[PDB]
Design a protein around this nucleic acid. Structure first.
Ligand SMILES: [Mg+2]
Ligand SMILES: [Mg+2]
Ligand SMILES: [Mg+2]
Ligand SMILES: [Mg+2]
Ligand SMILES: [Mg+2]
Ligand SMILES: [Mg+2]
Ligand SMILES: [Mg+2]
Ligand SMILES: [Mg+2]
Ligand SMILES: [Mg+2]
Ligand SMILES: [Mg+2]
Ligand SMILES: [Mg+2]
Ligand SMILES: [Mg+2]
Ligand SMILES: [Mg+2]
Ligand SMILES: [Mg+2]
Ligand SMILES: [Mg+2]
Ligand SMILES: [Mg+2]
Ligand SMILES: [Mg+2]
Ligand SMILES: [Mg+2]
Ligand SMILES: [Mg+2]
Ligand SMILES: [Mg+2]
Ligand SMILES: [Mg+2]
Ligand SMILES: [Mg+2]
Ligand SMILES: [Mg+2]
Ligand SMILES: [Mg+2]
Ligand SMILES: [Mg+2]
Ligand SMILES: [Mg+2]
Ligand SMILES: [Mg+2]
Ligand SMILES: [Mg+2]
Ligand SMILES: [Mg+2]
Ligand SMILES: [Mg+2]
Ligand SMILES: [Mg+2]
Ligand SMILES: [Mg+2]
Ligand SMILES: [Mg+2]
Ligand SMILES: [Mg+2]
Ligand SMILES: [Mg+2]
Ligand SMILES: [Mg+2]
Ligand SMILES: [Mg+2]
Ligand SMILES: [Mg+2]
Ligand SMILES: [Mg+2]
Ligand SMILES: [Mg+2]
Ligand SMILES: [Mg+2]
Ligand SMILES: [Mg+2]
Ligand SMILES: [Mg+2]
Ligand SMILES: [Mg+2]
Ligand SMILES: [Mg+2]
Ligand SMILES: [Mg+2]
Ligand SMILES: [Mg+2]
Ligand SMILES: [Mg+2]
Ligand SMILES: [Mg+2]
Ligand SMILES: [Mg+2]
Ligand SMILES: [Mg+2]
Ligand SMILES: [Mg+2]
Ligand SMILES: [Mg+2]
Ligand SMILES: [Mg+2]
Lengths: 162, 223, 134
RNA sequence: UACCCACACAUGGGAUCAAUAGGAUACCAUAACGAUGAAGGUCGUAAUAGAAUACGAAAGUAUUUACCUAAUUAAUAUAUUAAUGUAUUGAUAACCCUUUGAACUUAAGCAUAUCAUUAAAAGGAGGAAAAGAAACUAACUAGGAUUUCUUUAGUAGCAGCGAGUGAACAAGAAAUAACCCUCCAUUGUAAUCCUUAAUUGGAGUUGUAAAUGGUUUAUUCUAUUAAUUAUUAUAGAGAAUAUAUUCGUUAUUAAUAGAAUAGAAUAAUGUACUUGAGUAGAGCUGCUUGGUAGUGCAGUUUGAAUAAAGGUAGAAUGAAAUAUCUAAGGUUAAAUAUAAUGGUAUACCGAUAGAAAAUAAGUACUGCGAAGGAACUUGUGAAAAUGUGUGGAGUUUAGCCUUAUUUUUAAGGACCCGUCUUGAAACACGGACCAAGGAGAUUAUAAUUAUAGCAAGAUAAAAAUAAUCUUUAUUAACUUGAUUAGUUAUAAUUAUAAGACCCGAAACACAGUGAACUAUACAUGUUCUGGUUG
RNA sequence: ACCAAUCGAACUGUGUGGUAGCUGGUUCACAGCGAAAUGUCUCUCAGGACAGCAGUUAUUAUUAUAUAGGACAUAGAUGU
RNA sequence: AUUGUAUAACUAGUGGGCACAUGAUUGUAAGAAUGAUGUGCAAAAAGGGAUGAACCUUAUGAAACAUUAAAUAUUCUAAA
RNA sequence: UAUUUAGGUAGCUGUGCAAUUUGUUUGUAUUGAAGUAUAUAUGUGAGUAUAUAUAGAAGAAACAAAUGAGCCGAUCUUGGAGGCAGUAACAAUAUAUGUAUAGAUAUAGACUAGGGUUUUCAAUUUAUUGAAGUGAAUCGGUGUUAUAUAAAA
RNA sequence: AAAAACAUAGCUUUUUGUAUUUACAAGAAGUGAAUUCUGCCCAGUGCAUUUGUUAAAGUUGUGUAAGCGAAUGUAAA
RNA sequence: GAUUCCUACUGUCCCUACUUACAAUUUUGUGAAACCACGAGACAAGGGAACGGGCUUGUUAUUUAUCAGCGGGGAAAGAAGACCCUGUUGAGCUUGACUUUAGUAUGUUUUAAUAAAUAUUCGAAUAUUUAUUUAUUAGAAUAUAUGGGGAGUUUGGCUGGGGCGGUACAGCUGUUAAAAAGUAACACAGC
């Protein structure tokens, strides 16, 4: 130490216990392989399931919407499904969550009608394998990132704006 | 470092380096545990902690693709590489799309014979020789020249062109640099199909427009 | 890579270990020979392993052109001895020559130990392969 | 004759160059032991047998399996009537869960601290194990079981406040799944359970309750065996022979075993209001954590309430409001970690290298014992050290530099190199001679210089087909507040930590072996012959 | 004194490539430039850090209307 | 007298010194110990003091020709 | 266009030669590649190029890349071979015809502990190979115990 | 390093009456055969015997320990 | 065992001489080691790291290339000096060195039920003591004292070598000190 440096802080056992990432491209080949092999087992059904829309907790991320975990049974009561029937279709159900507002309940209730208007139901699996219908693979109806919009207002109303 | 040696010390008219203990053979009494000793480990042993890969900026990797493509249309850049293009018709050249219906090797070989494209197949074939170094014993026995490249649109490679020596194929989507400029020089003789050549105008745009397929890319200006 | 492993590999030392340490039916098929043209019209395959006593003819090498009968077969060396050929020794030239069976084509067979049963089994299995393709 | 030099030819030795049925590293699959006798050992069997290698009196090419060995006519326990049946015991050297637990070292000394919730040692299971359905996080317009990756972050904090050590929420992803006992289960009836060929013999009211069919057809995937492949080419990967041929590659089928999905047919459907005590918490005492006056655990004394009740909300106690949850009984797939064993590849080494071993290598050989542990491939034939033949000088002077056709002599110059040192030819240390080997390379974090892309913005984070920096704007806080072109990479140098340019102590701790030499106690055996005195 | 040729704490394996302000060694050519053995602090005196002496690269001209280990003219300080 | 001057950034070695001339302190004295000013050896070639780290002439690539300094001219040994 | 500058230990910077492997381009070889030994030319120097003999199968150059990247020394590691030197230090009974006549030194023989084929014979020169050889009711062990594993007296 | 060192009988002091063993016994120390002697000192340090200072836990609250200090003996300590 | 004197006795001595055996000297056979910068001839004086084989001025040997002796020199060979000093390097041992601990002594709380007596505080609370059988494995958790029987570690610097003595180890004045500023000594006279 014979010049102008910052105070170094390097721990003694930093290089003695090391984990190396040599298997990174070989791991990503396997995960796409079992994902594609699982798709043929349930052929007409989609790969993923439905998720609700929630808000983020703190004030740093207060203006962001995000895919949550599961649907409360009261939002299913608005759409008209029962929880033993809705689990057999690709719908996730959460029971720990509590209802808070009206705006977050009318949003999720409208979203369940859009999913019901698209799915069909056959008799048995022999009938379903014979029909050739394109199988969806990504997320199911995700959120999309917003674009900000600036409103133009007249000159008179700025003295009485809110 | 397998043994259990220890230094004997001074007072014996002998060096300080660690000696193999025990007895009963020619081995006992010899040195160990040093880089200057026979059957001893080397100082600074190599390890797998060493960095094996480098990191390059994304916008620079797309520039080197855009430059080496333009060199394949230049005349003297191809001739300095070593290809024989004296009798070829016009460069760049683009054949019709109906090419991937060929199911035999005999049919695809006539297509090169229809143009004046045979001496590249022969000059690859006569140039095979041994390697000068110790790499003969390590799966690097023969080395030969490089021939024509063919860019197509199919996501699976064509089995008709696989056997001919000195012909490589590459899809339009991936576009490696290990083929378009081998050995750090540009000017490889390329042949384009129809649909792949028509996909270039979306892939790079003009000097003012942005690319929509490649996000945040624009061709550089002239200094 | 123990012995007779029969691998798909491109290394020099891995392929050569399968040539020395092969056993069983794999050692037989290394010593095969090419068919004549008129024999090819009768059966239809390309090659077949070699037994003792059938008349062969050399088609390449310093002994080109001579025709003889097979006297011995050496499985441990991949060599055979053909009649009419002489090799120099330190006393005489009466030593018969040792050749590799990839340089010879045989002209007439020798039917011993169920040889006709084996040849007719291959000719049946060949034409069924052609019917799968069309 | 000996001593010295020059040339030519022969001995001695295994360096250089070229090859290779050997090794090293990374990735993928598997993850199969044992009382129905394992792993390991001793002795035997070949027509002429020693080493190596394979095999058990059926013995050197689908059954048998000599003798020890957990080694078992047993031991610790349960069931039926001293006998019989059932379960456990041994091997491991990587990953997993508990118990016990150091010192060398750093602080330029050392005693709290660090190395360290480490090494050694003991117990217990599986192909994975452990964990897992809030007596949670927060203060928002609120989120939602467990596990793993990026980031927050070398931050809040802890500490002779010294050296040093060190977390979580929120945010972006991989993968997703929830359930069962504990009351008073229709008392118009134990409706249950083990065993027997048999309501045969029991268990059970101090409370047991357990629906059943494997037939057939089709499809997909994995593993092992067997078969056919042009000489134009769905075959230019590679080997072998000689100076134009084969095995394969490529591309197709068959057989056996295992797994999953679907159809048809055969079997089968009653009633169910349970919530966890010598626990949770107090006083004294010891360990652990970043947790600061419990973050978590344990010994001793004491020991409650039952939803009109109880717990928690990052300084202490007492009190109050507002939020948000309900402990002390049980099961659970996927995403994740790594050996023995078998495969595939490579900017790795090429016989003083690579594993100790190109394998008659854990072999020969050493030690009372725990234990220690080498040399040797095939062609070419360097130097050190010698032999024979021919030629030449002198007896007073090795080798080197300069100038000269008196160059096997003459005149001048000239102490033996490396190294500490004010100062070395030194009576200062190392070096008799040749060959081969042999010491500032790698990684993390900062800074300056050169170069490249974009620029008020910059980016290959994990993953799939966000964050950080410019700029935490100052202050301990309140009160207050515009401004120095950056960020991402490639290369060289310097600083700190890693074995850290290479070789070198006297010592300390953990786990084990010796009274054949010699010392002491106990048991059992053996211990030659002649005189003196009194 | 003795405890297997070892005894004022035996022998074998591991932590271990234990720490050393202390001895020893450190491998190719030419060209440009070129030192210190002094001051202060230190459980400091066989060792460290700051200052001094050195090297490399860079930008800029009235900071030549300027500088100097010099001299001359003028005004002064001192107690050998 | 000087064609430049001035300003920044990064980084190494060294901190055991000795001798001559002038002048001092302690000591009977010392090739003894410790300070002050200048120049050297360390790190500096050739020629002369017979020989010598510091004495006397004297600035630096490879050579040839003429002139001197320090010192010398019986002989070794160039020069009455 | 140096008519001006050029020594140098510790130390700092620039231009260049040698070795192994990787991508691209150009070329050599059975009328003879790599290695080794003697000469000649060339470079201020690290070095390079050619010629003759020997041997028998693969090696060179240019533009870029990766380092286990250049020895006289460490009482350095492993192998081979000198001087001193044929020097120190040790061994050395008589017979003209003999499986004998003499001389000389040393007490000898059985059980146990330890050794394990050294025993005996044949053939070839304290060696090498090949055969043969160990016979128990009465000679040892196997039995009893030394106040919770003990006797070849 | 074989002695002038160690041992020895002889002399003396001390602890134990709940010993698998029982005071002519079982543990701990110093001098060194026999003969003749073994003087004075308890202030210091130790050892023994006997009636000002001092912790925690418990109770509505309060109180109580050994040890140290003081007195008396003891030098073949 | 350590020390002195008489008698006898003698190569211990005056002062050495002669004989024999075994090694040695001569021949054949088996056939090593320490040591080695270079050693090619040796001296007198000089200077020099203050005792040269080599450097500078002087004086000098030589049997055809030997054999057997001898111990002046090569500051001869063996062993990284045991004596002395330094190191912020160790170990055995002692104690009124620093910090602690096994063992042991004494309190408090836990301890079978029952009845009675006595004492101390205010009908009640404490304490002491006796008797019976219905318990009786014999211990556990904390506090104070004793504790080289044990366990870790330390035990400054300057200095005409270290130790003993002094502090020239922090402040102030005059002289050393040489007419600007700056300057040493276990030098001077003092605070
Ligand atoms: Mg090695
Ligand atoms: Mg080579
Ligand atoms: Mg360490
Ligand atoms: Mg320390
Ligand atoms: Mg230290
Ligand atoms: Mg220490
Ligand atoms: Mg700890
Ligand atoms: Mg799992
Ligand atoms: Mg589990
Ligand atoms: Mg920690
Ligand atoms: Mg029930
Ligand atoms: Mg074929
Ligand atoms: Mg509850
Ligand atoms: Mg080699
Ligand atoms: Mg080896
Ligand atoms: Mg001279
Ligand atoms: Mg000295
Ligand atoms: Mg001297
Ligand atoms: Mg000496
Ligand atoms: Mg020496
Ligand atoms: Mg070398
Ligand atoms: Mg060491
Ligand atoms: Mg121990
Ligand atoms: Mg001994
Ligand atoms: Mg200079
Ligand atoms: Mg030194
Ligand atoms: Mg400095
Ligand atoms: Mg004046
Ligand atoms: Mg120096
Ligand atoms: Mg001179
Ligand atoms: Mg003189
Ligand atoms: Mg003259
Ligand atoms: Mg120079
Ligand atoms: Mg190296
Ligand atoms: Mg060498
Ligand atoms: Mg050197
Ligand atoms: Mg040697
Ligand atoms: Mg003799
Ligand atoms: Mg024999
Ligand atoms: Mg005696
Ligand atoms: Mg003696
Ligand atoms: Mg005595
Ligand atoms: Mg007496
Ligand atoms: Mg007293
Ligand atoms: Mg008295
Ligand atoms: Mg004699
Ligand atoms: Mg002399
Ligand atoms: Mg003198
Ligand atoms: Mg002599
Ligand atoms: Mg020494
Ligand atoms: Mg010191
Ligand atoms: Mg100590
Ligand atoms: Mg002690
Ligand atoms: Mg001192």
């Amino acid at each position: 130490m014979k010049n102008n440096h910052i105070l170094p802080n390097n721990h003694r056992n930093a290089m003695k216990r090391v984990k190396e990432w040599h298997n990174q491209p070989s791991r990503a080949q396997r995960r796409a392989k079992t994902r594609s092999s699982k798709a043929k087992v349930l052929y007409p059904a989609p790969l993923k399931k439905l998720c609700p829309i929630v808000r983020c907790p703190t004030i740093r991320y207060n203006k962001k919407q995000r895919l949550g975990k599961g649907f409360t049974p009261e939002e299913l009561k608005e759409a008209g499904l029962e929880v033993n029937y809705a689990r057999r279709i690709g719908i996730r159900v959460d029971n720990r969550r509590r209802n808070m507002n009206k705006e977050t309940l009318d949003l999720n209730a409208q979203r369940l009608k859009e999913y019901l208007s698209k799915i069909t139901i056959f008799k048995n699996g022999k009938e379903a394998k014979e029909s050739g219908v394109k199988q969806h693979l990504g997320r199911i109806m995700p959120v999309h990132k917003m674009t900000p919009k600036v409103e133009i207002i007249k000159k008179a109303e700025v003295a009485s704006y809110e | 470092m397998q043994h259990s040696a220890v230094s004997w010390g001074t007072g014996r008219a002998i060096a300080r380096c660690p000696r193999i203990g025990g007895g009963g053979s020619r081995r006992s009494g010899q040195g160990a545990f040093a880089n200057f000793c026979r059957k001893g480990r080397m100082a600074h042993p190599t390890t797998t902690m060493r960095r094996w890969c480098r990191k390059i900026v994304l916008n620079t990797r797309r520039i080197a693709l855009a430059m080496s493509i333009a060199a394949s249309a230049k005349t003297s850049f191809v001739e300095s590489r070593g290809h024989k293009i004296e009798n070829l018709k016009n460069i760049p050249l683009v054949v019709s799309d109906d090419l991937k219906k060929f199911e035999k090797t005999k049919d695809a070989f006539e297509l090169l014979k229809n143009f004046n494209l045979t001496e590249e197949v022969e000059r690859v074939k006569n140039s095979k020789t041994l390697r000068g170094t110790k790499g003969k014993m390590r799966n690097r026995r023969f080395r030969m020249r490089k021939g024509l490249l063919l860019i197509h649109d199919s996501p699976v490679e064509l089995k008709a062109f696989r056997n001919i020596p000195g012909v490589d194929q590459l899809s339009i989507n991936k576009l490696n640099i290990f083929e378009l400029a081998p050995g750090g020089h540009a000017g490889r003789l390329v042949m384009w199909t129809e649909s792949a050549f028509k996909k270039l105008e979306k892939l790079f745009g003009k000097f003012n427009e942005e690319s929509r397929i490649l996000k945040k890319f624009t061709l550089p200006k002239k200094m | 890579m123990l012995a007779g492993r029969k691998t798909k590999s491109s290394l020099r030392k891995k392929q050569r270990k399968a040539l020395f340490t092969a056993v069983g039916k794999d050692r037989l098929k290394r010593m095969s020979s090419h068919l004549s043209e008129e024999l090819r019209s009768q059966y239809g395959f390309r090659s077949f392993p070699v037994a003792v006593g059938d008349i062969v003819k050399v088609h390449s090498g310093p002994y080109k052109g001579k025709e003889g009968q097979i006297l011995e077969v050496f499985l441990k060396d991949y060599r055979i001895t053909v009649e009419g050929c002489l090799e120099e020794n330190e006393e005489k030239e009466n030593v018969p020559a040792k050749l590799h069976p990839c340089n010879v084509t045989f002209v007439k067979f020798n039917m011993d130990n169920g040889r006709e049963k084996q040849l007719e089994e291959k000719k049946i299995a060949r034409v069924q392969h052609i019917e799968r393709e069309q």
